[PDB]
Design a protein around this motif. Sequence first.
Motif, short mmCIF file in Angstrom:
data_model
loop_
_atom_site.label_atom_id
_atom_site.label_comp_id
_atom_site.label_asym_id
_atom_site.label_seq_id
_atom_site.Cartn_x
_atom_site.Cartn_y
_atom_site.Cartn_z
N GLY A 1 50.78 30.77 44.57
CA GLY A 1 49.35 30.68 44.44
C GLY A 1 48.53 31.87 44.88
N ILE A 2 48.83 32.32 46.11
CA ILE A 2 48.17 33.50 46.67
C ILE A 2 48.42 34.70 45.79
CG2 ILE A 2 48.01 34.95 48.72
CD1 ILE A 2 47.13 31.96 49.00
N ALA A 3 49.62 34.75 45.22
CA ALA A 3 50.01 35.82 44.34
C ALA A 3 49.26 35.80 43.03
CB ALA A 3 51.48 35.70 44.06
N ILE A 4 49.05 34.61 42.44
CA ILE A 4 48.31 34.55 41.19
C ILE A 4 46.86 34.98 41.41
CG2 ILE A 4 47.53 33.03 39.34
CD1 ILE A 4 50.06 31.47 39.70
N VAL A 5 46.30 34.62 42.57
CA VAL A 5 44.95 35.05 42.91
C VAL A 5 44.87 36.57 43.07
CG1 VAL A 5 43.11 34.86 44.59
CG2 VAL A 5 44.37 32.85 43.93
N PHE A 6 45.81 37.16 43.81
CA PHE A 6 45.74 38.60 44.02
C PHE A 6 46.16 39.39 42.79
CE2 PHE A 6 46.06 38.12 48.86
CZ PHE A 6 44.68 38.05 48.93
N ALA A 7 47.00 38.80 41.93
CA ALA A 7 47.35 39.43 40.67
C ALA A 7 46.14 39.49 39.75
CB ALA A 7 48.49 38.66 40.00
N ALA A 8 45.35 38.41 39.73
CA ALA A 8 44.11 38.44 38.97
C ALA A 8 43.11 39.41 39.58
CB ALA A 8 43.50 37.05 38.89
N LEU A 9 43.13 39.55 40.91
CA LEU A 9 42.27 40.53 41.57
C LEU A 9 42.61 41.95 41.14
CD1 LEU A 9 40.15 41.33 43.64
CD2 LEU A 9 41.93 41.29 45.36
N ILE A 10 43.90 42.28 41.09
CA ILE A 10 44.33 43.61 40.67
C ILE A 10 43.99 43.86 39.21
CG2 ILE A 10 46.37 45.03 40.27
CD1 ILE A 10 47.55 43.68 42.79
#
Lengths: 59, 59, 249, 249, 74, 75, 75, 75, 75, 74, 48, 48
Positions: free
Chosen positions: H25-34
């Motif tokens: 989850g945290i990864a999908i959020v930060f991947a969308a951030l990048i």
Amino acid sequence: MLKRFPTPILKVYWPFFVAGAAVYYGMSKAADLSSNTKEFINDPRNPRFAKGGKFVEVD
Amino acid sequence: MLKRFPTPILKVYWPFFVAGAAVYYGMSKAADLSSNTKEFINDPRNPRFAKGGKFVEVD
Amino acid sequence: SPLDQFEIRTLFGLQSSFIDLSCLNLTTFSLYTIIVLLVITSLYTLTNNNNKIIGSRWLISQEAIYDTIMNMTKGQIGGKNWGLYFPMIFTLFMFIFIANLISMIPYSFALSAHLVFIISLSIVIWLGNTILGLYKHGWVFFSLFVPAGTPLPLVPLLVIIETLSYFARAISLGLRLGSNILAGHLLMVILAGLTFNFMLINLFTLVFGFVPLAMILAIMMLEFAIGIIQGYVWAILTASYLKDAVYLH
Amino acid sequence: SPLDQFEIRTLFGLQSSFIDLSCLNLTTFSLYTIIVLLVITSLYTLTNNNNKIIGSRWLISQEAIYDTIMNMTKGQIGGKNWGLYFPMIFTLFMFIFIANLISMIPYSFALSAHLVFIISLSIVIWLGNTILGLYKHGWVFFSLFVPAGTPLPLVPLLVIIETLSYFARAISLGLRLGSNILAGHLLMVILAGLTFNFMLINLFTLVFGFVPLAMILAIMMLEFAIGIIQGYVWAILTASYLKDAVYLH
Amino acid sequence: QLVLAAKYIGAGISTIGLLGAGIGIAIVFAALINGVSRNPSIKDTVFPMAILGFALSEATGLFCLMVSFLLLFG
Amino acid sequence: MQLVLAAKYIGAGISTIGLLGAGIGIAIVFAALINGVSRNPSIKDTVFPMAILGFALSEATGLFCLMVSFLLLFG
Amino acid sequence: MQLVLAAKYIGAGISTIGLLGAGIGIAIVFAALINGVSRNPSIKDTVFPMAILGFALSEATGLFCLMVSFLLLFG
Amino acid sequence: MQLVLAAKYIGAGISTIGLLGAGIGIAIVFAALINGVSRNPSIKDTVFPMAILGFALSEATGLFCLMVSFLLLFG
Amino acid sequence: MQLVLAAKYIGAGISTIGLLGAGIGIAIVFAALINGVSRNPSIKDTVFPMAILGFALSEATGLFCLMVSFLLLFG
Amino acid sequence: QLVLAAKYIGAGISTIGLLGAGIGIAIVFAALINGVSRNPSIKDTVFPMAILGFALSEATGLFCLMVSFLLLFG
Amino acid sequence: MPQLVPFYFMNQLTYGFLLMITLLILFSQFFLPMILRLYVSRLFISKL
Amino acid sequence: MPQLVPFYFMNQLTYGFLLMITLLILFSQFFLPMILRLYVSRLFISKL
């Protein structure tokens, strides 16, 4: 201080109040049905003991 | 109606009041000693149950 | 269980969990004390028609009670200052006199038949005699315990079984009244319980079943006498006891 | 027992034997409702300095809450008469917003984490939508249960599992809020209970025992967010539900 | 527990001695009434003797009551 | 357990014999009252408080025995 | 419960004895009444209510011992 | 009580699985951030608090499954 | 009696797997929020209520599973 | 009473199906956010389709919850 | 005896002693001298 | 769960609905229009 304004709060919100009375009554009967279970028949703060009856205590 | 007359009721009756306080205190301790007996430890209208503790019930 | 008429039931209620406030709450005993106080208030407030001198027919009753307790406590303690102890000798009467007429009413309740309150009131009056006697007369208060000119080789026996009678006085004065009121009410309820089941057998018993009814009526006639006489005997013994405590024989 | 923080204790007390008057009595839940009412009274009464127009710095807060709930319920029900249901959509907010900041104070107590009250409030709002919808729109209220232009051979399935979602709405709206507040408080108390027994072993743990303290501080930072967001989500779903009940799709 | 039942029989039997006490207080106040009625000017002279004799007779009826209380409570 | 209640009721029966020491008591007091009033008709208002005093202050010793009977019966 | 019910009957038997106090008592009161009327026949309406009062107050002590028997028979 | 304490350990084992939700989850959020910063590097101070908010609100759902394991280990 | 509490705690452990269906849920919602704000900077004040709505109205289905876990653990 | 304990395992296992429901509501509102952000004038046109799809997906997550309530209470 | 030994001892004794102090103050200051005013008034009109 | 199922259901619900009707009447008649008076006053001085 504060000047009271006569806002219409009865010819708008009547089904909320009717539902409130209905849920009040249904929760009254639910509380009376739950206060006589096996787990809670010997908890001494229920309002059975303040009027008459004492200690079925057969489980 | 009624005119109150200041009759001396304190510089006459003080040992009655001192005795009243003493019997009040002694009956308080007597009631606390009697409310924990074997016969009356499971009568649910005693003031033990209104504060904390519940059901020693080992006799 | 013929003794169910003395049950104490809680009515208005009060409780907490911080402090034990269950001592004071309106109860059957408490409600009948409120009724006794309002009756005694009613016998003097609205009795007097507009503060008239002539003293209407209701006030003759509370005139006669006043006079028969003045002329009783003047003939007991009767010293330099008898009137200083007259309000207590009157308010020990009127409580017992009203609380034994209210208890005669059929669906009602005896304040006087609670031994724990009356014995407590008696112990209060006994300690209030001993403390008053010690305060007024020092170490020579114990001169009450020797009767008169007596031979000295039998004085300590006559001191021991004088002091035993001195602190039997603490509970005797109360338990007399408690026993009279309790035995009278228990007698009436038991005879009513017997004559009820006497009159439910075959129809020939309701015929000439008037004589046990008349016996219960006669006992109720007796019971006012045994209720008012005890209200007088309380107020004569706690006048004699103040004679002993205030004046050394 | 990490869940002892939700115990309900009776304080002022009241009882009887005639009637069950134990329903109303001042209790921990009741005392915190009195506190919520006095806080909400305090946010508007003494906030306004002598009824000044300029609206001092305290009143900007209760200005912004008003405006962010007007501009939220204008964008949901948004019809001819949206303002007639605006006091309820505001007083469903402010109770949950104040009762989830009071509960953050350490030795305090969550009103919102009682499922029996919040589920009851949700069922009240659901029945008050169904009764209002039936009264305003007759027998054609059930036109809400068909979505749009749909093929007729699959309409009754799409009616059954539309009405099942219609009366799951009665308990879902409450149990969302109850679950969030209860899980947040139980999380904080359990992590406090673990870091306490972490710091009572050998003295090397109080050295560099700052990182679990910082984790609990971070969770408390998260908990205001999860407490205010639920107060907003309640007031957005019971605006959408009045859009469905008042206006037929 | 035969003793717990037999102390009640003893507390019952030991209360019979008040029979003498009641008759005793009666005979004392009976003589007091006769003495006042024969000689009307002797009441304040002889009345403390009557109260003394009553106090002694009750205490010597009261021995039975305190023995009954020791049997019933001790 | 039957023995305790049995001897309890027997002792409560035994502890009512002392009322014959009170019936005769009230008898002798009012008998002397009658003989004292009859032989001197102007002593009634002086001898009547001593009569009531002796009456109840003699019954008390029968009522003590009745209270022993009540504490046996019901306590 | 046969023993306690057998003890009830014995207790009701023992609680009959106290009536002899009243049986001698009423008689001593009325005997003094007769011997007071014979010494002075003018004091009848003064003395006879006191005789009725002593009758009642001794009959009360009789009935206080009868009621214990009525408890032990039935109650 | 050996069975229930053996079941406690298995339950704490099962309540570990829900952390994979947060881990993805945290990864999908930060991947969308990048992928949002790379499309537009000017919207950083607008977008990044929403990424921190989504981080927190998914980490809450992770910790809600960790606390059940901490109950089943000790409490 | 040990079996009831044992299977109770096992079922309470099983009933926390559904939170991985909520962590990924909050993730995908805030991921679309980031990608929607980044590609159009003037849509934030229109898309943010739908973001908060979708966030909590998707968690609710993980919190139902956590309430099944709480009714198992403590009820 | 093996059945009274084994209904709790069933009530635990039958709650796993909400995994699909949460991901489902996420994918629906994710597509809604992308659709509004690409075409800003489609919100009032397509938003009831989003609320419809959410209602259907929750109910088809809710089947598992009502089966869990039947196992735990029936 | 069962009925005169409850927990209500402090109840009994509390309202009883409140009533005793009440009737004592109440009788002594109010109701006995309102009879004695009648007495002194009757005797004062009698002496004139 | 043991703590949210006591006898206090009617207690909870009674003070809760009293507070709800209280805040409803109280907000609607008092506190929302005291903000709206500020609004109409600011706009009335603005229009002049």
